[PDB]
PDB file of all heavy atoms in Angstrom:
ATOM      1  N   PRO A  85       4.866 -28.444  -9.917  1.00 56.01           N
ATOM      2  CA  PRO A  85       5.312 -29.749 -10.581  1.00 56.01           C
ATOM      3  C   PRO A  85       4.158 -30.766 -10.710  1.00 56.01           C
ATOM      4  O   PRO A  85       4.141 -31.455 -11.759  1.00 56.01           O
ATOM      5  CB  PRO A  85       6.356 -30.251  -9.645  1.00 56.01           C
ATOM      6  CG  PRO A  85       7.057 -29.004  -9.112  1.00 56.01           C
ATOM      7  CD  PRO A  85       5.901 -28.025  -8.988  1.00 56.01           C
ATOM      8  N   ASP A  86       3.274 -30.883  -9.743  1.00 51.32           N
ATOM      9  CA  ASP A  86       2.189 -31.884  -9.819  1.00 51.32           C
ATOM     10  C   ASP A  86       1.036 -31.371 -10.640  1.00 51.32           C
ATOM     11  O   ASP A  86      -0.010 -31.983 -10.685  1.00 51.32           O
ATOM     12  CB  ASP A  86       1.681 -32.307  -8.398  1.00 51.32           C
ATOM     13  CG  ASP A  86       0.976 -31.219  -7.614  1.00 51.32           C
ATOM     14  OD1 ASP A  86       0.753 -30.160  -8.135  1.00 51.32           O
ATOM     15  OD2 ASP A  86       0.541 -31.529  -6.517  1.00 51.32           O
ATOM     16  N   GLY A  87       1.241 -30.221 -11.304  1.00 53.93           N
ATOM     17  CA  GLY A  87       0.238 -29.648 -12.235  1.00 53.93           C
ATOM     18  C   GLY A  87      -0.748 -28.714 -11.633  1.00 53.93           C
ATOM     19  O   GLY A  87      -1.371 -27.941 -12.413  1.00 53.93           O
ATOM     20  N   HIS A  88      -0.911 -28.777 -10.277  1.00 53.70           N
ATOM     21  CA  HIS A  88      -1.933 -27.861  -9.716  1.00 53.70           C
ATOM     22  C   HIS A  88      -1.449 -26.445  -9.825  1.00 53.70           C
ATOM     23  O   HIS A  88      -0.261 -26.196  -9.932  1.00 53.70           O
ATOM     24  CB  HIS A  88      -2.302 -28.247  -8.261  1.00 53.70           C
ATOM     25  CG  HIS A  88      -1.522 -27.590  -7.212  1.00 53.70           C
ATOM     26  ND1 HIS A  88      -0.262 -28.005  -6.849  1.00 53.70           N
ATOM     27  CD2 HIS A  88      -1.818 -26.551  -6.398  1.00 53.70           C
ATOM     28  CE1 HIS A  88       0.215 -27.233  -5.849  1.00 53.70           C
ATOM     29  NE2 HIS A  88      -0.715 -26.349  -5.539  1.00 53.70           N
ATOM     30  N   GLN A  89      -2.376 -25.491  -9.773  1.00 53.53           N
ATOM     31  CA  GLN A  89      -1.964 -24.074  -9.805  1.00 53.53           C
ATOM     32  C   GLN A  89      -2.609 -23.306  -8.685  1.00 53.53           C
ATOM     33  O   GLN A  89      -3.700 -23.616  -8.138  1.00 53.53           O
ATOM     34  CB  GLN A  89      -2.078 -23.467 -11.218  1.00 53.53           C
ATOM     35  CG  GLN A  89      -3.311 -23.922 -12.015  1.00 53.53           C
ATOM     36  CD  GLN A  89      -3.254 -23.251 -13.368  1.00 53.53           C
ATOM     37  OE1 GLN A  89      -2.197 -23.244 -14.045  1.00 53.53           O
ATOM     38  NE2 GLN A  89      -4.381 -22.792 -13.857  1.00 53.53           N
ATOM     39  N   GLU A  90      -1.856 -22.261  -8.263  1.00 52.92           N
ATOM     40  CA  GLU A  90      -2.145 -21.398  -7.190  1.00 52.92           C
ATOM     41  C   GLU A  90      -2.186 -20.027  -7.712  1.00 52.92           C
ATOM     42  O   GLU A  90      -1.297 -19.581  -8.458  1.00 52.92           O
ATOM     43  CB  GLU A  90      -1.032 -21.642  -6.169  1.00 52.92           C
ATOM     44  CG  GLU A  90      -1.224 -20.971  -4.799  1.00 52.92           C
ATOM     45  CD  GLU A  90      -0.187 -21.435  -3.788  1.00 52.92           C
ATOM     46  OE1 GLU A  90       1.011 -21.187  -3.920  1.00 52.92           O
ATOM     47  OE2 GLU A  90      -0.671 -22.062  -2.777  1.00 52.92           O
ATOM     48  N   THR A  91      -3.175 -19.245  -7.364  1.00 55.22           N
ATOM     49  CA  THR A  91      -3.267 -17.866  -7.690  1.00 55.22           C
ATOM     50  C   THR A  91      -2.677 -17.066  -6.504  1.00 55.22           C
ATOM     51  O   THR A  91      -3.172 -17.234  -5.359  1.00 55.22           O
ATOM     52  CB  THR A  91      -4.684 -17.327  -8.021  1.00 55.22           C
ATOM     53  OG1 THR A  91      -5.190 -18.132  -9.123  1.00 55.22           O
ATOM     54  CG2 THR A  91      -4.706 -15.878  -8.410  1.00 55.22           C
ATOM     55  N   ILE A  92      -1.651 -16.286  -6.756  1.00 57.30           N
ATOM     56  CA  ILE A  92      -1.009 -15.430  -5.704  1.00 57.30           C
ATOM     57  C   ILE A  92      -1.459 -13.997  -5.850  1.00 57.30           C
ATOM     58  O   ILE A  92      -1.093 -13.380  -6.845  1.00 57.30           O
ATOM     59  CB  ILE A  92       0.540 -15.533  -5.782  1.00 57.30           C
ATOM     60  CG1 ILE A  92       1.020 -16.980  -6.020  1.00 57.30           C
ATOM     61  CG2 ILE A  92       1.154 -14.930  -4.578  1.00 57.30           C
ATOM     62  CD1 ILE A  92       0.797 -17.837  -4.822  1.00 57.30           C
ATOM     63  N   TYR A  93      -2.245 -13.481  -4.899  1.00 59.64           N
ATOM     64  CA  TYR A  93      -2.672 -12.065  -4.869  1.00 59.64           C
ATOM     65  C   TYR A  93      -1.623 -11.272  -4.176  1.00 59.64           C
ATOM     66  O   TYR A  93      -1.360 -11.497  -2.969  1.00 59.64           O
ATOM     67  CB  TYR A  93      -4.052 -12.064  -4.170  1.00 59.64           C
ATOM     68  CG  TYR A  93      -5.176 -12.627  -4.946  1.00 59.64           C
ATOM     69  CD1 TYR A  93      -5.419 -13.984  -4.992  1.00 59.64           C
ATOM     70  CD2 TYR A  93      -5.994 -11.832  -5.720  1.00 59.64           C
ATOM     71  CE1 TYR A  93      -6.415 -14.558  -5.732  1.00 59.64           C
ATOM     72  CE2 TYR A  93      -6.938 -12.365  -6.481  1.00 59.64           C
ATOM     73  CZ  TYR A  93      -7.206 -13.753  -6.491  1.00 59.64           C
ATOM     74  OH  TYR A  93      -8.195 -14.304  -7.232  1.00 59.64           O
ATOM     75  N   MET A  94      -0.957 -10.415  -4.920  1.00 61.96           N
ATOM     76  CA  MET A  94       0.149  -9.687  -4.331  1.00 61.96           C
ATOM     77  C   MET A  94      -0.116  -8.184  -4.240  1.00 61.96           C
ATOM     78  O   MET A  94      -0.548  -7.538  -5.217  1.00 61.96           O
ATOM     79  CB  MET A  94       1.467  -9.837  -5.158  1.00 61.96           C
ATOM     80  CG  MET A  94       2.056 -11.237  -5.214  1.00 61.96           C
ATOM     81  SD  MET A  94       3.297 -11.395  -6.760  1.00 61.96           S
ATOM     82  CE  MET A  94       5.105 -11.116  -6.152  1.00 61.96           C
ATOM     83  N   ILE A  95       0.201  -7.627  -3.091  1.00 64.67           N
ATOM     84  CA  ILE A  95       0.123  -6.180  -2.834  1.00 64.67           C
ATOM     85  C   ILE A  95       1.563  -5.733  -2.778  1.00 64.67           C
ATOM     86  O   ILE A  95       2.289  -6.218  -1.907  1.00 64.67           O
ATOM     87  CB  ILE A  95      -0.641  -5.775  -1.585  1.00 64.67           C
ATOM     88  CG1 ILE A  95      -2.156  -6.220  -1.784  1.00 64.67           C
ATOM     89  CG2 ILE A  95      -0.559  -4.294  -1.333  1.00 64.67           C
ATOM     90  CD1 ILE A  95      -2.851  -6.230  -0.447  1.00 64.67           C
ATOM     91  N   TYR A  96       1.980  -4.798  -3.647  1.00 64.61           N
ATOM     92  CA  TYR A  96       3.252  -4.228  -3.601  1.00 64.61           C
ATOM     93  C   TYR A  96       3.258  -2.952  -2.762  1.00 64.61           C
ATOM     94  O   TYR A  96       2.459  -2.015  -3.022  1.00 64.61           O
ATOM     95  CB  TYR A  96       3.675  -3.882  -5.003  1.00 64.61           C
ATOM     96  CG  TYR A  96       3.976  -5.033  -5.972  1.00 64.61           C
ATOM     97  CD1 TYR A  96       4.130  -4.771  -7.322  1.00 64.61           C
ATOM     98  CD2 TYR A  96       4.246  -6.325  -5.506  1.00 64.61           C
ATOM     99  CE1 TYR A  96       4.445  -5.777  -8.192  1.00 64.61           C
ATOM    100  CE2 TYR A  96       4.513  -7.355  -6.441  1.00 64.61           C
ATOM    101  CZ  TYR A  96       4.678  -7.058  -7.749  1.00 64.61           C
ATOM    102  OH  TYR A  96       4.973  -8.032  -8.720  1.00 64.61           O
TER     103      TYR A  96
END
Side-chain angles (χ1 to χ4, degrees):
Chain A
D86 69 1
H88 92 279
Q89 36 183 44
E90 188 167 66
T91 302
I92 316 292
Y93 288 82
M94 295 161 98
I95 297 167
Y96 292 168

